[PDB]
Amino acid sequence: VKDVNQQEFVRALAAFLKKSGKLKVPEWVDTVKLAKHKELAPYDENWFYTRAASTVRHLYLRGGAGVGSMTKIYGGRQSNGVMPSHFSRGSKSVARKVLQALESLKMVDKDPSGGRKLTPQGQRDLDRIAGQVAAAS
Amino acid sequence: IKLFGKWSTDDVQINDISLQDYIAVKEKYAKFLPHSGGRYAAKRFRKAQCPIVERLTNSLMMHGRNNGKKLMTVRIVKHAFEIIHLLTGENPLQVLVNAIINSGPREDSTRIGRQAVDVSPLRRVNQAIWLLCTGAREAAFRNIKTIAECVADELINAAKGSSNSYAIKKKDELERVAKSNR
Amino acid sequence: NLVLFDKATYDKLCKEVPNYKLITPAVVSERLKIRGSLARAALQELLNKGLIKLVSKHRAQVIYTRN
Amino acid sequence: EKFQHILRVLNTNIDGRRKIAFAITAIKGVGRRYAHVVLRKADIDLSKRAGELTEDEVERVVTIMQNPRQYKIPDWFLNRQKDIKDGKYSQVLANGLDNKLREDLERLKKIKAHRGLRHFWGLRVRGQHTKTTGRR
Amino acid sequence: QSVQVFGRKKTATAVAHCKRGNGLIKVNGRPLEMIEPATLQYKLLEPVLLLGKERFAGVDIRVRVKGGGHVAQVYAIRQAISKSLVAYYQKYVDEASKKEIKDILIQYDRTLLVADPRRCESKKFGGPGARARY
Amino acid sequence: RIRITLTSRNVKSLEKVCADLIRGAKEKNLKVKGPVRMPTKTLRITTRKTPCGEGSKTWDRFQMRIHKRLIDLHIEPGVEVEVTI
Amino acid sequence: QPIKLARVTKVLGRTGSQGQCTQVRVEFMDDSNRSIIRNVKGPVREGDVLTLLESEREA
RNA sequence: AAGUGGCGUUCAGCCACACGAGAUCGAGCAAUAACAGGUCUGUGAUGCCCUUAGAUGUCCGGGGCUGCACGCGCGCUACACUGAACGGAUCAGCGUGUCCUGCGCCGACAGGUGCGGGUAACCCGCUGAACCCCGUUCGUGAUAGGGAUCGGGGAUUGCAAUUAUUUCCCAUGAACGAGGAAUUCCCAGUAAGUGCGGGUCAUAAGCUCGCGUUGAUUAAGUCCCUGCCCUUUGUACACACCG
C-alpha cells in the first residue's frame, strides 16, 4: 500500500469498499460518535467505509493489532472544558465491529499470536487499489 | 539554479547600502525553504546571516497560540508569496526586501530622565520585520481576510510606500518624533 | 453577510470576479457582501467551467486567478 | 428562490440563514448532537440552509424531534429519560423544557431535599466551593 | 559493497543503508517524496537537488528512522542520506569525488554532515521548565 | 547452558566479579558469552527537603542505580548472583 | 538637506542610563573627512553603514 | 582560550576566525557567620507545663475541615479563521507495574466478561501521545468561539458519595471581543505551545516533580530603578537602630 499517498489511498479504498456492497455497516452508524472525546458525529455519511479502508491499511503496515490497538490508533485529544486536555482512546465497539466487517470479506483473519492480521486476499486487494491511485496520479 | 521552488533568488537587488549586508537573500543564503534552524541565536551577529524569509517566518509566530508552530508560518509565507506574485508580477522576494527598505526606521528617540539617536543597520531590519508581522497580525485578528492575504497586503503596501501599511505608519511616526526631539 | 445569491449579486460574480488579480473566497466575500461559505462554493463552480484558474489549494487558503 | 429568513418552529424563531443542522439548535431541548440525528433519520441533505427547506420537510423534522423513539432513536440519546413520575422516555422541547426544569426544582423543594434548598437559597448545588467563586 | 551511516537530530536516529544499484531512495520502505510532512519535502530533497541525481543513480538508499518528532526525523533523514553518500564515496570511490561532494554539502548547510548537540534541558524545581520560574 | 545474572549498585565491584567469572571459567575451556550489559535502572526519589512547609520549594533528588549484567556459559559484598539453566 | 550615508569605523562605548545607545565615531564615505561621532541605538559593530538623516550636529 | 588575527602594563585576559562532536552545559556539593527564620502536627529527638479515666489517652458512629454579602495569592480555560469542529496521515522520551495491561466477545459511551502475559531491555510495548501535517465543511457574527452554571439518566471505586468521589450520555449555553493602576518569569533546543510519566492514589490532577515534542523575538549591555556586597566616613550604638 506504500509508494503512493496514504490519504488518497484510504479514500479510493473506501470507494472500492463501498462499490463492493458487502460490508456489514451496523444499524447504529447514524447515532454513534467515533470516540468519547468527540463532540459531534462524523460529517461524512459513509464514515464506516472510510474507517474500514483506513483500518485494513494499518493492518497491512503493522499486523496483529487487535481492537485495543485500533482504539489507540484512532484516539486523540480530549477537551475537558476548563481543565487541561488529555489523550483519549477511540471507540471500542466501533473498532470491534469494523474489524469483524473486514473478516466477512476474507481480508482479515485472527492472528495466531496476538489479535488480527491481514490475509493474502486482503493483501492482494490493497495492492490493486494501491496501483489504481498510482496510475491516477 | 537555486530557488524557493518557483521563485528565483537572483535578480533581487538591495537599494540601501546599509541594509545590503544585513539582508541574506542572494547567492549565499538561498534555500528551498525558510526553515533551516541554523542556531542563529548563538552569537552577537549571527541573525544577520539568517535569510529574511526565515526571519519573516520566525516573526509570524508571535502569540501564546502560535509559539512552536513554524510549519504553519512557513505555509503562510509560502501562500503570501503566491498572493504577492499574483497581485504584482514582480518577484515576491523583491517585494519583501523592498518592504524592509521602507519599514526600517533610520532614527529613533531615547528617553532621558528625550533625545534623537541613530539606528543600527541590524535594528532596522529587526524592527522592519517586527513592524510588518505586527501589522498583518492585527489585520486578521477578527476578519474573514486570511493571514496569507494580510501578509501579502502588508508587504506590497510597504514595498510601495502607500502609507497604508501598518509598518509605514509606525516608521514615519518614530521618525517624526525624533525629528522634533533632536 | 449574504447567505444565498441574488439575481443582482450572482450576475455581479460572473462578470467582474474572473477579471480580478487575486481571486480568493475571502476577497470576493468582502466586496460582494456574501458569507465565506457561499463565496467558497461559488468560486469552485467557476473553476469547473474555466472562467478562473487555480494557483494553489490548501485547507484554509485557496488561491484562484484569471485566465 | 422562496427562501425563508426566519422560520417559526415550535414558537421559536429559527434563523433560516444558518445551516439546517445548527439552526435547529436554537430550539431549547435540542443541541448539536440531537439536531444531527433527527436530520439523519429524516433523509434530508445537511448541506443546505434552514430557509432552503420546503414546508413539508420542516414538519417532518418536528415529528421526529417530538417523537424520537418512534423513529429509532435510542433511550440514551434523550435529555428527559426515565422520568420520576411517568417514566416515559422523551425529548422535552422548548416549552416542555422549562416546565420540566421548573417542576423538578419544585419537587426537590417541597420535600425539603438538600439540592432543593440550595436552589431556593440561590447557591451552588453540586458541591462547588462558594468561598471565592460565584460572586455574580 | 554498502555502508550504514546514521543521522541524529534531538532524538531522531535515521540510519541510511547506501548500497550499490539504481537511484532508489526510500525511508522505511516509502519513497522520499512520500513522507507525510509536505512542507518539509524540500529539506529531504536537498542532498539530491544539490548533488544532482547522477550521483545517486548508482546507489540505493533505505533509511530507517525512529525517535524524535516529525521535524526531527526530517533533518535526520537528510543528514543520513548526505553522510551515507560521503561514506560510500570514501570506501568505494576515490577520495577526490568525496571532497567534490563534501564541499557542496558543507558550503550549503553544515547540518547535513555534522549533527548539532542541542538537546532538551532538565527541568528545575520551582519552575515550569528549564529556565522559567513560578 | 547456564545463565548467570549479576546485579549490583556499584559498577566497579560488579565488573570485578564479572571479570573473575569469565576468566575463572575461560581457563576451564568453557565457551562463554560476553557480559551482556542490561540498561541501568535509576531509582528516582524526589522529596521535599524541609520537614515542614516553610522551605522555599527546594526539592532534593535521590538516585539508586542498579546495574545488571548477565553471563551465559556452556563474589564481593553488594553484588547479587543468580544462576539459571 | 540630504540624507547622508556614513560608515562605522570605531566603537567607543555605551552611553545612556541603561546603556541602550552606543557612542560610535562614524565617518562619511564620500570623502575621508568629517569623522563625526554619533549615538546609535541597537547592535553596532565596526564596519556598519549608518543612514544619517541629519549630519550637522555632533551630539 | 590549543591554533590564527586583533585589542591589552603586548602581562592577566578579551574579541574575531580556522579546525572541530563543543570554543561559557545542567544539576549536585557548597566557607566564616547570622536569624529569636520554619518545624514539639515527621520521629519510641526532647525540657517544662497541662490533661490523665465523667480523659486532651483510645475506639466506634455522625458532622466539620467543601460551610459564603466580600478582599487577595498561585493556577487552568478562553475571548477564535495564526481558529472550533469532522475525517486522513504521521512522529517521542522519562518512567511505573503483583499491580501494569495485552487479545477474543458485550455495549452508543462509560462499563462488563472469559482467556492471557509480565516481579520485567523479555509482557503492556515498535509505548501508533498530543500539538503538528493533509482534506473537509463552518465565515465581523457572544457563532460550529467560550463549556461556566443546572436538569434527566447509565456505570465504576468502596463498608458507605447526600454537601453532586470520579466517569459517560443527552440537554442547559453564563461572564469573557487581549484586560485599569500595577506586577511576574525569562538569553537557546531557552521562552512559549503541546502531550506523556512519576509523586498523592480503594476512587484520583486544574497541583507538583520529571520527560520528550514543536520551537522563536530580543539582548552579548548598564547602574537608571529596585536589591545586596565592599571601601571610605560618622556614632553617646556593642542586648549592637527592633539600639
Curated annotation (Swiss-Prot), chain F:
One of its GO terms (biological process) is translation. GO terms for cellular component: cytosolic small ribosomal subunit. Keywords: Cytoplasm, Ribonucleoprotein, Ribosomal protein. It is found in: Cytoplasm. One of its GO terms (molecular function) is structural constituent of ribosome. The keyword Zinc-finger does not apply. Belongs to the universal ribosomal protein uS10 family. Component of the 40S small ribosomal subunit. Component of the small ribosomal subunit. The ribosome is a large ribonucleoprotein complex responsible for the synthesis of proteins in the cell. This is Small ribosomal subunit protein uS10. It comes from Xenopus laevis (African clawed frog). The chain holds residues 19 to 116 of 119 of the full protein.
